[PDB]
Amino acid sequence: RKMAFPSAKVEGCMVQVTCGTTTLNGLWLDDTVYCPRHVICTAEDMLNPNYEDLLIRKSNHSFLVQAGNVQLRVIGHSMQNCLLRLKVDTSNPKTPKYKFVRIQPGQTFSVLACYNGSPSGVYQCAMRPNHTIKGSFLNGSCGSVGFNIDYCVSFCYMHHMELPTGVHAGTDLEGKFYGPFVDRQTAQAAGTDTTITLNVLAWLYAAVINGDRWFLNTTLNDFNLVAMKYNYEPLTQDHVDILGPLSAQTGIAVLDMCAALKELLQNGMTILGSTILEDEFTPFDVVRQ
């Protein structure tokens, strides 16, 4: 439901890496291909892997690099933190002026989503304060990359894991995970599912300006008590501030949206087609109106 885009510049950099029975997206710059190192793991390896050892039990032929119907013969491999590095026998002719950089939560950036290796548009987003990312466009697209363009492509992220809570964890282009997340499978989603109130509210406003109103018709402090009980994020004045422009058009005040939300929370449910309160959309995604 978000808004995709082009950027053929980055789509030319995408390739896929296969090892054993796994295939994920990889980034192809010059004659190097980058992708999550877990690609080399079998389902069982993931329960507790020693990557240094598993890598030893591999060779350049264990990996197949595909650029569509084209193959990139691997001539070398190594490991950089949580990234698997591969050397191919030819460099990407469409490599842009690039640099790898590490960012912080809140900073917006572009992500090129893929469906079975096939690019499906780039989306705007940012990592939550806990360094995870909320966005359906990352489901079933391990390895996609995040970036920012300025004149030079600044790569700042690579998708690695989809948490069971519907949130994703990734690394920077140096293979260092953003946050406490690891690349083995255990329970690490703790505190990763508190519902983002600001987004739910904006999502409600997007609903108003679309015919949805049956859910319409409290104070901050009072409201947050309900926020606490239902594991929603505490609404701040700054959050109300942001929803100002949205409150403007719609004509419904923020606290009156909270009163609306508070009801939906205490007395559950279709809104915008969805039968659930969506929280993956920022006020900004909605300002597309």
Residue 202 sits in a domain whose CATH number is: 1.10.1840.10
The dihedral built from the CA positions of residue 260, 232, 167 and 150, taken in this order, carries a sign that is: positive
266 lies in some domain: yes
> Which tokens is 212 given?
């949805």
142 is catalytic: yes
Please give the Cα distance from 36 to 82 (Å, whole number): 6
Please give the Cα distance from 64 to 74 (Å, whole number): 7
159 is catalytic: no
* Pairing, β 153-163 against β 98-100: parallel
> Which tokens is 13 given?
């950099």
Is residue 67 domain-shared with residue 103, that is, in the same domain? no
Which CATH number goes with the domain that contains 115?
2.40.10.10
Unique residue bearing structure tokens 């859910």 = 215
What's the structural domain count of the chain? 3
Is residue 114 domain-shared with residue 84, that is, in the same domain? no
Is residue 144 domain-shared with residue 207, that is, in the same domain? no
How many alpha carbons lie under 13 Å from residue 176 in its C-beta half-sphere? 7
Q: Which residues partner with 77 through β-bridges? A: 86
Please give the Cα distance from 182 to 236 (Å, whole number): 31
Q: Which residues partner with 157 through β-bridges? A: 146
Please give the Cα distance from 137 to 4 (Å, whole number): 9
Please give the Cα distance from 111 to 230 (Å, whole number): 31
Domain boundary among 118, 153, 178: 178
Is residue 205 domain-shared with residue 259, that is, in the same domain? yes
Please give the Cα distance from 105 to 58 (Å, whole number): 36
Please give the Cα distance from 89 to 287 (Å, whole number): 46
Closest CA to 196 of 287, 103, 108, 283: 283
**Of 13, 35, 38, 114, which one is the catalytic site residue?**
38
Task: For residue 265, give Cα distances in angstroms to 197, 198, 276.
Answer: 12, 15, 11
Question: Which residue intervals of the chain are DSSP H helices?
Answer: 8-11, 51-56, 197-208, 220-229, 237-242, 244-250, 254-266, 283-286
Whether 217 and 262 have beta carbons less than 8 Å apart is answered as no
**First-residue to last-residue Cα distance in the chain:** 13
Is residue 240 domain-shared with residue 267, that is, in the same domain? yes
**Of 82, 142, 156, 258, which one is the catalytic site residue?**
142
Whether 279 and 200 have beta carbons less than 8 Å apart is answered as yes
204 lies in some domain: yes
2 lies in some domain: no
Residues spanned by the domain of 146: 7-11+96-178
> Which tokens is 96 given?
């842009």
The C-alpha angle with vertex 49 and arms to 44 and 50, in degrees rounded to 5, equals: 145
Across the chain, which distance is largest between two alpha carbons, in Å? 65
Domain boundary among 49, 64, 89: 89
Q: Which residues, 6 or more positions from 267, have their beta carbon under 8 angstroms from its beta carbon?
A: none
Resolution rounded to one decimal, in angstroms: 2.5
Return the H-helix or E-strand segment holding 278: none
Closest CA to 113 of 87, 137, 140: 137
The DSSP string of 26-93 is EEEETTEEEEEGGGG--TTGGGS--HHHHHHT--GGGEEEEETTEE--EEEEEEETTEEEEEESS--T
